[PDB]
């Protein structure tokens, strides 16, 4: 029994990049389940074996982490091409880990054929024909299916909370009390504006000391539908393995998501935030039933309520520590279900 896990569109080496980090973390959580797993990437490394040195059909299961397959500048991207070539030769079912609604499985050949460098690859080499099982982070399978409406071989769909992987690591640990330097914090990309309204509502013109880290930059917020006067401070990107420590610098950390994420996705940030020393404040619309934490104090409906809640935490250290204790307790209640989680994952990949 040998399992192979690959990232469909990014090179995997270490924790210097987010997609590489995510693949390594998934590799780790699967391995810790008592399974033999290899990460296959462009070259052999501390965490990987090269695509060329192995033979895909020697593996009993092929797991693929979702990614975009867009070629920038219309130039070749070996991570994408080699991953799909690897997938194309596999003769069994492919398990696609669908954690980002915007990254559904897609065929690269259709884009390659019209390229001047098309002569470098053949349809036979890149067209993936094996049946595929999409393992959806989102519970709503129709949304997942709508996202894959163009593919002809994506046959199955099954929900599984993939991004709980950070809390189930053998080396997982809650963040410790941290000196506060910010009132509110949020880390992420601009996600092509798929969440601009919420970002402006909760992070702009608040009068609070707010920091926005990650790939997002102030100049990206220019939609006339969502005006603002004073923006939060944009500090740049940090390694994925440092996100909880970063969140911990603030009194509170914001939870928001894409339209299709509301009452559907429980993203990685939910856990990175819950496990941090920052009080988790959730956009009401993101979890209307309060399923993450059955305590309305952790939820905010708009800018005004966010401002009120944050001030409350600033004027009462005891309230802040109470809420942190509660989210830490809730996080642990989910960790106590690791066995179930592991068995659910194994079943998801037909083991
Ligand atoms: O500087 C940063 C900012 C974000 N992240 C990671 O990127 C995720 C955010 O991804 P995205 O912006 O797509 O938001 P999501 O849709 O995950 O909420 C975080 O949870 C982190 O794991 C990171 O590693 N470094
Ligand atoms: Mg994610
Ligand atoms: Mg309220």
Concatenating the DSSP letter of every residue in 211-256 gives EEESS--GGG---TTS--SS--EEEE---GGGHHHHHTTEEEEEE-
Instruction: Classify residue 90 by its DSSP letter.
Output: -
Residues of the chain with CATH 3.40.50.2000: 1-166+333-349, 167-332
Which residue's alpha carbon is at the smallest distance from atom 10 of ligand 1? Answer: 188
Phi and psi at 186, nearest 5°, equal -155, 130
Asked if 23 and 5 touch (Cβ cutoff 8 Å), the reply is yes
| Binding site membership of 243 for ligand 1 (Cβ less than 6 Å) | yes
Is residue 203 within 6 Å of ligand 1 at its C-beta? no
The technique is: X-ray
Catalytic residues: 22, 72, 100, 191
Sheet holding 182-187, edge to edge: 233-236, 210-213, 182-187, 250-255, 279-283, 299-300
Helix (H) or strand (E) holding 64: strand 61-65
CATH superfamily of 167-332: Glycogen Phosphorylase B; (3.40.50.2000)
| HSE-up of residue 100 (Cα within 13 Å, Cβ side) | 12
Q: Could you identify the residue written with the tokens 């696609």?
A: 96
Asked if residue 237 has its Cβ within 6 Å of ligand 1, the reply is yes
Q: What is the rounded CA–CA span in Å between residue 76 and residue 201?
A: 39
Write out the two tokens for 57. Answer: 């059909």
Q: How far apart are CA 303 and CA 219, in angstroms?
A: 21
Residue 287 Cα, ligand 3 centroid: separation in angstroms? 13
Q: Which atom of ligand 1 is nearest to the CA of 258?
A: 16
Give the resolution to one decimal, in Å: 2.1
CATH assignment of 1-166+333-349, among 1.10.1740.10, 3.30.110.70, 3.40.50.2000, 3.60.15.10: 3.40.50.2000
Strand partners, 228: none
Q: Using alpha carbons only, give the angle 183, 187, 191 rounded to the nearest 5 degrees.
A: 135
For ligand 1, atom 7: residue with the closest CA:
188
Query: Tokens standing for 192?
Result: 């092509």
- Count of H helices and E strands in the chain? 11, 13
Q: What is the DSSP letter of 202?
A: H
Pocket lining: 27 vs ligand 1, CB cutoff 6 Å: no
- Nearest one of 107, 82, 112 to 96, comparing CA atoms: 107
Report the first-to-last Cα separation within the chain, whole angstroms: 10
Helices (H), the chain: 18-31, 78-89, 109-112, 123-126, 141-147, 196-203, 243-247, 268-274, 303-314, 317-335, 338-348
In DSSP terms, 283 is beta-bridged to: 300
């Amino acid at each position: 029994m040998k399992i192979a896990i690959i990232n469909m569109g990014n090179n995997v080496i270490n924790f210097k990049t987010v997609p590489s980090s995510e693949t390594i973390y998934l590799f780790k959580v699967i391995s810790e389940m008592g399974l033999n797993v290899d990460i296959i990437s462009l070259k052999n490394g501390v965490y990987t074996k090269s695509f060329d040195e192995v033979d895909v059909n020697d593996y009993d299961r092929l797991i693929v982490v979702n990614s975009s397959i867009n070629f920038f500048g219309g130039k070749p991207n070996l991570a994408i091409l080699s991953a799909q070539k690897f997938m194309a030769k596999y003769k069994s079912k492919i398990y696609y880990l669908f954690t980002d609604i915007r990254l559904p499985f897609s065929q690269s050949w259709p884009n390659v054929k019209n390229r001047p460098w098309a002569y470098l690859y053949t349809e036979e080499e890149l067209l993936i024909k094996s049946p595929i099982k999409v393992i959806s982070q989102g519970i709503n399978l129709d949304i997942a299916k709508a996202a894959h409406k163009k593919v002809d071989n994506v046959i199955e769909f099954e929900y599984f909370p993939i991004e709980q992987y950070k809390i189930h690591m053998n080396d997982f640990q809650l963040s410790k009390p941290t000196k506060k330097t910010l009132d509110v914090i949020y880390g992420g990309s601009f996600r092509s504006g798929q969440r601009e309204s919420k970002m402006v509502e909760f992070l702009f013109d608040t009068g609070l000391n707010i920091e926005f880290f990650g790939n997002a930059r102030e100049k990206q917020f220019k939609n006339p539908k969502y005006p603002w006067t004073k923006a939060p401070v944009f500090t740049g990107k940090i390694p994925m393995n440092m996100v909880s420590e970063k969140n911990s610098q603030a009194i509170a950390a914001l939870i928001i998501g894409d339209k299709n994420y509301n009452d559907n996705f429980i993203t990685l940030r939910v856990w990175e935030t819950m496990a941090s020393d920052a009080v988790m404040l959730i956009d009401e619309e993101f979890d209307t039933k309060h399923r993450i934490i059955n305590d309305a104090r952790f939820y905010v409906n708009n800018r005004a309520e966010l401002i009120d809640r944050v001030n409350e935490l600033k004027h009462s250290d005891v309230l802040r520590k109470e809420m942190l204790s509660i989210q830490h307790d809730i996080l642990n209640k989910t960790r106590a279900k690791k066995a179930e989680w592991q068995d659910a994952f194994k079943k998801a990949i037909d083991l």
